[PDB]
Amino acid sequence: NFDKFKGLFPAMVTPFTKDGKLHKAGVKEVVNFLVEKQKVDGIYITGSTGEFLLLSFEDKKEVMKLVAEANAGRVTLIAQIGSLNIEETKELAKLAKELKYDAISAITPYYYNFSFNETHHYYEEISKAADIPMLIYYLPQLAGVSTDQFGKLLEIKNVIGSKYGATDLFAFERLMSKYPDKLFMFAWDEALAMGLTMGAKGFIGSTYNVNAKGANAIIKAWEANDKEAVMKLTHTYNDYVLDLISKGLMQSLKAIMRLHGVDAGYTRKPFWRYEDEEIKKHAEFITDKYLK
Amino acid sequence: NFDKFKGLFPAMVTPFTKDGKLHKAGVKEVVNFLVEKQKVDGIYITGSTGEFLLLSFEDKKEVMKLVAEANAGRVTLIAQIGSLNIEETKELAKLAKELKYDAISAITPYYYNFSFNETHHYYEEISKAADIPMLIYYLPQLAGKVSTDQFGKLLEIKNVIGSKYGATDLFAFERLMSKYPDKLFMFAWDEALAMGLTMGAKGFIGSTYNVNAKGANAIIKAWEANDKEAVMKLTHTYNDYVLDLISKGLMQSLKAIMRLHGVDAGYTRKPFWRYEDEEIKKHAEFITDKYLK
Amino acid sequence: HNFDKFKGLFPAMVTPFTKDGKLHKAGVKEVVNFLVEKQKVDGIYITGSTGEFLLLSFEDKKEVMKLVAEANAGRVTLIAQIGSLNIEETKELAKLAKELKYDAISAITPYYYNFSFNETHHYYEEISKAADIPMLIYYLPQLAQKVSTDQFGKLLEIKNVIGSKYGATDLFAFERLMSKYPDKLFMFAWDEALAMGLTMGAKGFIGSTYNVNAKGANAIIKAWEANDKEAVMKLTHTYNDYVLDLISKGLMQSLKAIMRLHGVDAGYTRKPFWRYEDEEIKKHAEFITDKYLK
Amino acid sequence: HNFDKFKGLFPAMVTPFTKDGKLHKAGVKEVVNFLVEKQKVDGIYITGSTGEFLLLSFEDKKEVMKLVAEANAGRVTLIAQIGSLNIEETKELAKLAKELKYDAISAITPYYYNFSFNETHHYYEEISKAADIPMLIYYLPQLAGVSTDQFGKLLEIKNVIGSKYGATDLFAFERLMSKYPDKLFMFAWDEALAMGLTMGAKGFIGSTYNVNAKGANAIIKAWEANDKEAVMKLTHTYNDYVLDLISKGLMQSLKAIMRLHGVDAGYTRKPFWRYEDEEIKKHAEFITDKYLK
């Protein structure tokens, strides 16, 4: 079953010290905050929100092991392990398998307009590296890609589905219609209820790091058929999303966590470093408005 | 309150003869078919689906009168009356009121990139014409974008009751629903009907309701009934219909299906492509048999 | 060389209206006289975007065409933009242009709806049958799906079609068309890249900005023909400074106010275009004139 | 004040790799020789997109810099693209550039994330303190949602002598030449070389100059010589060549043309497509025979 892939999966921040060192103690404290205080169903690690492009190859493995250790099998684990370095991505798949990750994902080849063919080969080679379920990222165009064409990706060995993060809910509806056998994790935080309505059961998002409660409220209202409440709670949540990102996203999440006694550290360069007081007031503003 | 604006409002097609004359007896038959067979809650006339840019000023007034007559107060009526001629628009608004149209709408100034200020003045002028509710079109960007806030100044213009929202941007729609709960937002994106209902839309305007009101009403019914899985299944079927339907020109396909049902809905006007009779007839049957049986 | 009459600057002529909104028939003549005699233009492109053609009635259009013919009295080349979604009207406009001795006609792409290639091809095909007068098609990047260099050639092969008015800011597509179709005429309608156009073989230029700055635009051409490459640069910076400054207020309101300042009865824009306060627009007209048109 | 060293053709060098992906070190030298002696370039631009920089390790990059500084021995101008999301590795690479007497460095726009202006500025600010070597910033249309004025504050940062301008936007290029006459802008759009010339570009960086520098020098010479018609005809041939070249993958076609001239320029690194060996060689043979004889 995909039962373990139901519910909320924050895209986990990766804690760094002020000087840009991987803050190992922080990683564990974050995982504990998510499992125990946020009460998440799973954790999605080393994605965009985890600052993965700013992590060294060894930083990556360290975080994967540290997370595995802190979780202690309590919640579902997914590691985002894709990069342009195919050999590193292969070892990472093995390491995910070894550490008992529930699934992996790999972001679409970026920067260059890599072709459908190149993308297919990218994902094909990675599937032979280990037997661990794979989620691909949704990709509208590569050099110029039909919902039929994306099906070819979906059928590669070990691929169970797709992380769907595009703002295009018609494509999402078309995929849910064509591939009812595949798992689609919905990655568009401000359209959670929309997601639910076309059959999404699992959600990966940055914003669930510190407001799983507000997101679960929408899901619980939806299952209980309180349609008015689905609307009001969504308006509130999307208020929260927009207030949140009036300062840098990862700086805000890390500050909110620090305000809650979690050692979540700081972003790396080149992300902007705010004055401690400025980001503290922002953390308080979000916390007081939304997270009581 | 806004109760008369609940349900389905097909964007009515405008029947023309094969040589493109306004087919006056066709207009009334289409109205009958929509009320009697599609069981619509309302009808939305002379928009893009009604080929309004291909109508003369005299055609527009005539269509309004023929619709008003055949309807006979049975369903709610909204007239899209906007163009670049502000005096013709004002006159169509007074005619709307006279004919007891429930609301009017006007498309955004088009072709040129008209500024916010110009668009606001254009709607302001229209409001002083007749005392009838007005729905403005939703506006993403105006000669370089318009916020939730900047758009609200359009919503506050005298007689403006709300907006016809057709954009495929469901976040923006959510934002408008939050900020303006006292305004009427008619939802015009047929393929996101259930997603529209989920965020509070209660009225739906669209070309696809001309011949599949039953299929869209099925979605609405399952939604109000809390049948989550039927909402999904019926939307999958309905959107299959939409993609199948527009594999030929929309209005040719919609008029061909009406003719197939024995309704004198006529044909489109130049420069829309005119298909061979048998090709468009087979398309019509294909749609009918697959979805409309 | 039969395209000789299509060389040089072709202002996209404004259409004078009264403050009321009426077609100002006397103004039409004065504008034409202004452009021939003071701007010393090579031709005039009438009832295009800049001529507010979408706010013109069918009669207004025929009237403007007749009046421009009469005022020009054959002095310069005349091209009439006549396209609309009313095909029977465009057909009559094509016959009228022929009757009035216009040198070419043009027709905008079918707009507002996403018309397909086959619909666009059929539209242009029906027009070409109406009268024996040279046709310039508008350059079309994308119709609802991309239009290729090869696909646009199917439009250029329609009877009477001699070329294309090319307005996109994509100068690569332009280089490609001049390479593939040197037997066709390409009227270059991106004023802020005049010298770029020259460089790739453009000899005719249709633009809003030549209504009041034909001298500035001619200086760039002359510098280029004289191989004064530094001056091509300097004269472009200046000209483009002028364009940006000009469109700081609405274009057509700016163009008409600049003409009115020079004593030309150019009138005003129609609704829904913004009507500026009397003095605000005059002062704008003075600024541009003092800075660029001395 | 004097930018004489940066006039002419500056191919974006390819980075040679073995069939199985190692950094073919001697291959780097055979390419550097082949561009200097046989393509007759004025300069080389190393470890850019065309040099597959994102597929190179930190050590790889350091190695390529050293190898190039060696095989050139000061014969042509050298520019290093050294930018990445690791600020400390860029800070180092700019000291390595200053040490190997590189004439210029550049750093790409922070990529993948939508980094803001403030972030972009601070990142160039940081890279400058590292080493007193002149910097060329990449031209940037938009950061996280970008004034020609704002882009000037980036030009003001210590050690910045101008910009690598690659956008297909010839208007904003004309605008930049107008406002900052005291700055070097290297023109990085191969298909509009003659249009860059027209507005004052004097140095050119690009991937196509790897195997057809002669064909592009032909355009510059005709231009300076005021031969208007040949500028046109020679541009048309060059752009036929460019569209022909990129009918298969760029780096694979280029590397394969080089291997065809007995230059050991190897292959691309994963994830780039690897062609069946007869396919890309028939492509190498076609381009060479039609354009490079």
Q: Where exactly are the structural domains of chain B? A: 1-293
CA pair distance C269, C255, nearest whole angstrom = 10
List the chains bordering chain B where 3 or more Cβ pairs fall under 8 Å. A, C
Sign of CA dihedral B111, B112, B113, B114: negative
Which residue's structure tokens are 């990102």? A245
Experimentally determined by: X-ray
Contacting subunits of D (3+ beta carbon pairs below 8 A): A, C
Report the catalytic residues of A. Answer: 137, 163
Instruction: Please tell me whether C206 is known to bind a ligand.
Output: yes
Q: Does an interface of 3+ CB pairs under 8 Å exist between B and D?
A: no
Question: Would you tell me the crossing angle of helices C58-72 and C87-99 to the nearest 10 degrees?
Answer: 20
Give the residue among A177, A149, A170, A151 at the shortest CA–CA distance from A162: A151
Q: Cβ contact (<8 Å) for C112 and B117? A: no
Q: What would the two tokens of residue A215 be?
A: 């997101």
Pairwise CB contact (< 8 Å): A114 & D271: yes
Q: Which of C116, C126, C272 sits opposite B273 (nearest CB)?
A: C116
Of D116, D181, D156, nearest to A270 (Cα)?
D116
Contact D52, D84 (CB under 8 A): no
Q: Report the length, in residues, of chain B.
A: 293
Crossing angle of helices C171-180/D228-245, nearest 10°?
A: 100
For residue C33, give Cα distances in angstroms to A4, C53, C67, C104.
Answer: 80, 20, 11, 20
* D170 neighbourhood in chain C, CB within 8 Å: 169, 171, 193, 196
User: Which chains touch C (3+ CB pairs under 8 A)?
Assistant: B, D
| Residue from A84, A114, A122, A142 to probe the interface with D (highest D Cβ count within 10 Å) | A84
Sorted by sequence, the CB contacts under 8 Å of residue D203 that are 6+ apart come out as D3, D6, D7, D8, D10, D42, D43, D184, D186, D187
Query: Mind spelling out the 3-state secondary structure of B145-187?
Result: CCCHHHHHHHHCCCCEEEEEECCCCHHHHHHHHHHCCCCEEEE
For helices C229-246 and C278-292, the axis angle rounded to 10 degrees is 170
Q: Which whole-number Å values give the CA distances from C152 to C139, C177, D147, in the listed order?
A: 8, 9, 35
CA–CA dist A80, A126 (Å, integer): 13
Region for D144 from its dihedrals, namely left if φ exceeds 0, alpha if ψ lies in -120 to 50, beta otherwise: left
Written as one string, the DSSP assignment of chain B is --GGG-EEEEB----B-TT--B-HHHHHHHHHHHHHTS--SEEEESSTTTTGGG--HHHHHHHHHHHHHHHTTSSEEEEE---S-HHHHHHHHHHHHHTT-SEEEE----SS---HHHHHHHHHHHHTT--S-EEEEP-S-S-----HHHHHHHHTSTTEEEEEE--S-HHHHHHHHHH-TTSEEEE--GGGHHHHHHTT--EEEETTHHHHHHHHHHHHHHHHTT-HHHHHHHHHHHHHHHHHHTTS-HHHHHHHHHHHTT----BPPTTSPPPPHHHHHHHHHHHIIIII-
Structure tokens at D201: 């570009």
Identify all chain B residues contacting A198, using CB atoms and an 8 Å cutoff.
Answer: 194-195, 232, 235
Number of Cβ within a 10 Å radius of residue A181: 8
Chain A: residue whose CA lies nearest to D115 = A271
Which residues of C are designated catalytic? Answer: 138, 165
Chain-chain contact of D171 with C169 (C-beta, under 8 angstroms): yes
Judging contacts by C-beta atoms under 8 Å, the chain A residues touching residue B167 are: none
Q: How many CB atoms lie within 10 A of CB D197?
A: 20
Find the CB nearest A198 among B168, B169, B235.
B235
C-alpha to C-alpha distance for D64 and D49, rounded to whole angstroms: 14
Q: How many C-D residue pairs are in contact by the CB < 8 A criterion?
A: 62
Copy the structure tokens of residue C129: 């049958």
Q: Which two tokens stand for residue C12?
A: 């996209």
Query: Chain C interface, mutation test: which of B52, B83, B85, most C Cβ atoms within 10 Å?
Result: B85
Residue type at B57 in one-letter notation: F
Contacts of B68 (CB under 8 A, 6+ apart): B77, B99, B100, B101
Spell out which chain D residues touch chain A, with contact meaning CB-CB distance below 8 angstroms.
49, 54-55, 85-88, 110-113, 115-116, 118-120, 122-123, 126, 270-273
Closest-CA distance, A250 to chain D, in angstroms, reads 12
Q: Residue B185 forms beta bridges with which residues?
A: B163
HSE of C253, CA atoms in CB hemisphere, 13 A:
20
Give burial (CB, 10 Å; 0-12/13-18/19+) of A113: exposed
Residue C193 phi/psi, 5-degree rounding, is: -130, 30
Cis peptide before C141 (omega within 30 of 0): no
- CB-nearest to D273 from A53, A115, A125 is A115
Chains C and D touch (3+ CB pairs under 8 A): yes
Q: Which residues, 6 or more positions from D87, have their beta carbon under 8 angstroms from its beta carbon?
A: A269, A270, D123, D126, D127
Which residues of D sit in the known binding site? 50, 205
Query: D186 with D165: CB under 8 angstroms?
Result: yes
**Amino acid at the residue B1:** N
Q: What are phi and psi of C14, to 5 degrees?
A: -70, 155
Superfamily of domain C1-294, CATH level 4: Aldolase class I (3.20.20.70)
Q: How far apart are CA A215 and CA C86, in angstroms?
A: 53
Strand order in the sheet with D104-107: D8-11, D203-206, D184-187, D160-165, D135-138, D104-107, D77-81, D43-46
- The answer to whether the Cβ–Cβ distance between A86 and D54 falls below 8 Å is no
Q: Do B125 and C271 touch (CB under 8 A)?
A: yes
Pick the CATH number of B1-293 from 2.102.10.10, 3.60.110.10, 3.20.20.70, 3.90.870.10: 3.20.20.70
Which token pair is D127? 């890279």
CA distance A104 to A81: 7
Show the tokens assigned to A291: 């997270």
Q: Rounded CA gap, D81 and D46, in Å?
A: 6
| Interchain pair A84, D55: CB under 8 A | yes
- Which of D182, D220, D176 shows the shortest CA–CA distance to D202? D220
Taking domain A1-292, whether its CATH number is 3.20.20.70 is answered by yes
D124 counts as catalytic: no
In contact, B97 and B132? CB cutoff 8 Å? yes
Please give, one letter per residue, the 3-state secondary structure of chain D.
CCCHHHCEEEEECCCCECCCCCECHHHHHHHHHHHHHHHCCCEEEECCCCCCHHHCCHHHHHHHHHHHHHHHCCCCEEEEECCCCCHHHHHHHHHHHHHCCCCEEEECCCCCCCCCHHHHHHHHHHHHHCCCCCEEEECCCCCCCCCCCHHHHHHHCCCEEEEEECCCCHHHHHHHHHHCCCCEEEECCHHHHHHHHHCCCCEEEECCHHHHHHHHHHHHHHHHCCCHHHHHHHHHHHHHHHHHHCCCCHHHHHHHHHHHCCCCCCECCCCCCCCCHHHHHHHHHHHHHHHHC
Of D49, D87, D271, the CB nearest to A122: D271
CA dist D181 and D199 (Å) reads: 12
- Nearest-Cα distance to chain B for C46, in Å, is 17
Closest Cα of chain C to D200: distance in Å?
7
Q: Distance between CA atoms of A245 and A190, rounded to whole angstroms?
A: 12
Name which of D191, D199, D200 is nearest C172 (Cβ-Cβ): D191
Query: Cβ A191–B171 below 8 Å, yes or no?
Result: yes
User: How far D293 CA sits from the closest chain A CA (Å)?
Assistant: 31
Cα dist. C105→C33, C85, C188 in Å?
21, 16, 15
Chain A residues closer than 8 Å to B199 by CB: 193-194, 231, 234
SS3 readout for chain C? CHHHHHCEEEEECCCCECCCCCECHHHHHHHHHHHHHCCCCCEEEECCHHHCHHHCCHHHHHHHHHHHHHHHCCCCEEEEECCCCCHHHHHHHHHHHHHCCCCEEEECCCCCCCCCHHHHHHHHHHHHCCCCCCEEEECCCECCCECCHHHHHHHHCCCCEEEEEECCCCHHHHHHHHHHCCCCEEEECCHHHHHHHHHCCCCEEEEHHHHCCHHHHHHHHHHHHCCCHHHHHHHHHHHHHHHHHHCCCCHHHHHHHHHHHCCCCCCECCCCCCCCCHHHHHHHHHHHHHHHCC
Q: Tell which residue, A189, A185, A219, has the closest CA to residue A80.
A: A185
One-character DSSP codes across chain A: --GGG-EEEEB----B-TTS-B-HHHHHHHHHIIIIII--SEEEESSGGGTGGGS-HHHHHHHHHHHHHHHTTSSEEEEE---S-HHHHHHHHHHHHHTT-SEEEEPPP-SS---HHHHHHHHHHHHHH--S-EEEEP-S-S----TTHHHHHHTSTTEEEEEE--S-HHHHHHHHHH-TTSEEEE--GGGHHHHHHTT--EEEETTHHHHHHHHHHHHHHHHTT-HHHHHHHHHHHHHHHHHHTTS-HHHHHHHHHHHTT----BPPTTS----HHHHHHHHHHHHHHH--
